[PDB]
């Protein structure tokens, strides 16, 4: 004669062990970390013999015990997330009885309760396996959710072992963050962002795109995450062994890295770090994207030969900090960084000290030339040097060359692809039918901003005939050239991708990464695994 079955009462099913306004605009007031959630039960009896003993299981393991034999609830303490069986029985001294389960859903920032990400292989990417060994990394920008319509569900996962997510801010207002002000809406957003929030504390630039807006399977209004985060997670589900990296910084947010002279601020950016990643479990470990140590970056002002010091002591730091994340979760996180590839940046920070610390160095081979000088026409990202100018310093081969020299392990070194083209347009005064012998009137018109071109429009334009395709052989670079009205745009195809391909095998190096994925028509992506010897 055990005790009656006991009936469930209503409730609440879903609980979150990391918090989530759905409506705020502040950090702060965005996500409250907790230990775990605080699960809770109702069940009615009807035979009203208050049993000795209750409890309550998930999946057929204890999570809690008490004596609430008539009609009673329970509360305790849920600390990995997931989807839960919930079941409450009662014991007298003849047996036992079980109510009825009923599924609970206890959300963390790992994707736990999410099923895998419903990834899309569009296009012209096709699947690889990650066999070589070598890193496959691809940036995802947050902004991407917006007029490029490219969400996390858009990415082509199986080709990547590494997802960059661009960008993490640090925060801080006049002063702080000024490289954000040339943006409009962008230094405003970030100060909604941190209203109430230490400086060079890291934070979230777009909490809408990030965490609210309704996104693929993350739709439902009490869905806990949505947006990249919330696919990100997703991702996480699908290939667990993808890494997933924040990227603090860029061009328009490195500014606050400047003043990490002081420690105190150091030690408090590295440790929102820590925060950071106890609060979004999904991230694998830190990017770090100082551009650049000792200046030349966005902002014209700041730069001192001391940052290269400061760089190793925040590689230090972040490692230790990171090591101690190890202890608590016993997971293994990775420290990356991405770093200049013209030599003028590189002889600044000592990377043979750093390199000790970081797993891999993103050699941003890219952005050589630009349509920030009306003059200086060249190749964005080639491999070596044009004949046309064949002490060219700012390639990628002189500048791994360059960073090699520095004691740097080839392993560590992953050189960078372009998925963009940067343009000039009323190019003249060329000889030799060289159009980079000449000088622009201004920057080429691009799909969203001027003198920048995703290579999904290059690549549909060159089909429809309205460019001249050359190929730089000596150079390894492409570029098309308009005659009628001096468009010229630099940027990496499949030819020259392939070509930084095999520098990297046969240099020993770590592999590719490229910037930035929503411009890719999966060609690109596709050159990246074929030229790092993946498998088809
Ligand atoms: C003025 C300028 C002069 C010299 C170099 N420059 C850059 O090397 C540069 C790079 C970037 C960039 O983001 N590269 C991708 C990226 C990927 C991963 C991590 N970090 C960065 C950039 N946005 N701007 C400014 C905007 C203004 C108009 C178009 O470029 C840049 N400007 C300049
Ligand atoms: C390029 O030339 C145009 C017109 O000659 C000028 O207005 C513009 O400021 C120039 N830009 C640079 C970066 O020199
Ligand atoms: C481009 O501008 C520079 C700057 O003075 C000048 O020296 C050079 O001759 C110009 N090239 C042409 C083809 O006009």
Same mark, same amino acid.
């Given at each position: ?25 502040? +950090? ?88 895998? %990400? ?61 490289? %954000? ?15 109430? @929030? ?12 990030? %965490? ?64 950071? !990643? ?40 972040? @490692? ?14 990775? !420290? ?57 310093? +700012? ?59 995703? +290579? ?81």
């Amino acid at each position: 004669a055990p005790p009656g079955k006991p009936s469930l009462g209503w409730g609440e099913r879903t609980f979150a062990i990391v918090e989530v306004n759905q409506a705020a605009t502040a +950090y702060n007031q965005l996500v409250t970390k907790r230990d775990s959630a605080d699960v809770s039960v109702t069940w009615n009896v009807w035979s009203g013999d208050p049993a000795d003993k209750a409890r309550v299981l998930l999946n057929d393991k204890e999570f809690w015990s008490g004596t609430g034999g008539a009609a009673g609830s329970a509360s305790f303490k849920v600390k990995k997330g997931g989807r839960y069986q919930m079941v409450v029985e009662l014991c007298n001294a003849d047996g036992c009885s079980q109510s009825d389960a009923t599924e609970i859903i206890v959300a963390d920032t790992d994707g736990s309760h999410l099923p895998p %990400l419903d990834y899309n292989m569009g296009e012209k990417n096709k699947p690889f396996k990650q066999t070589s060994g070598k890193v496959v990394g691809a940036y995802f920008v947050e902004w991407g959710v917006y007029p490029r319509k490219f969400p996390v569900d858009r990415v082509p996962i199986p080709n990547l072992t590494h997802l960059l997510y661009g960008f993490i801010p640090i925060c801080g207002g006049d002063g702080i963050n000024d490289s %954000l002000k040339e943006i409009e809406g962008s230094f405003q957003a970030l100060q909604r962002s941190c209203s109430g @929030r230490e400086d060079f504390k890291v934070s979230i630039h777009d909490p809408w795109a990030a %965490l609210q807006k309704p996104q693929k399977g993350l739709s439902s209004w009490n869905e806990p995450y949505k947006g990249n985060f919330g696919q990100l997670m997703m991702l996480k589900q699908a290939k667990p062994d993808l890494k997933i990296l924040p990227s603090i910084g860029g061009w328009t947010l490195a500014d606050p890295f400047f003043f990490f002279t002081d420690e105190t601020k150091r030690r408090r950016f590295v440790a929102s770090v820590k925060d950071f !990643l106890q609060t979004w479990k999904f991230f694998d470990g830190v990017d770090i994207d100082w551009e650049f140590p000792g200046g030349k970056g966005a902002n014209p002002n700041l730069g001192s030969p001391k940052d290269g010091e400061i760089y190793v002591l925040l590689m230090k730091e972040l @490692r230790e900090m990171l090591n101690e994340l190890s202890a608590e979760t016993g997971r293994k996180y990775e !420290l990356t960084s991405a770093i200049s590839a013209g030599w003028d940046k590189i002889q600044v920070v000592d990377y043979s000290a750093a390199q000790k610390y970081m797993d891999h160095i993103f050699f941003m081979s890219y952005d050589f030339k630009g349509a920030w000088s009306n003059d200086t026409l060249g190749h964005q990202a080639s491999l070596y040097a044009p004949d046309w100018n064949e002490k060219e310093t +700012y390639t990628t081969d002189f500048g791994v060359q360059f960073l090699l020299a520095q004691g740097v392990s080839p392993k560590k070194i992953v050189v960078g692809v372009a998925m963009y083209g940067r343009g000039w347009t009323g190019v003249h005064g060329y000889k030799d039918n060289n159009p980079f012998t000449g000088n622009a009137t201004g920057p080429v018109k691009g799909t969203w901003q001027d003198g920048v071109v995703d +290579y999904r429009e290059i690549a549909t334009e060159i089909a429809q005939g309205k460019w001249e395709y050359h190929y730089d052989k000596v150079a390894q670079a492409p570029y098309v050239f308009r005659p009628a009205t001096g468009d010229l745009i630099t940027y990496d195809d499949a030819r020259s991708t392939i070509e930084k391909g095999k520098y990297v095998r046969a240099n020993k190096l770590g592999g590719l990464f490229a910037w930035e994925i929503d411009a890719d028509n999966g060609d690109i992506l596709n050159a990246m695994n074929m030229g790092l010897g993946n498998s088809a």
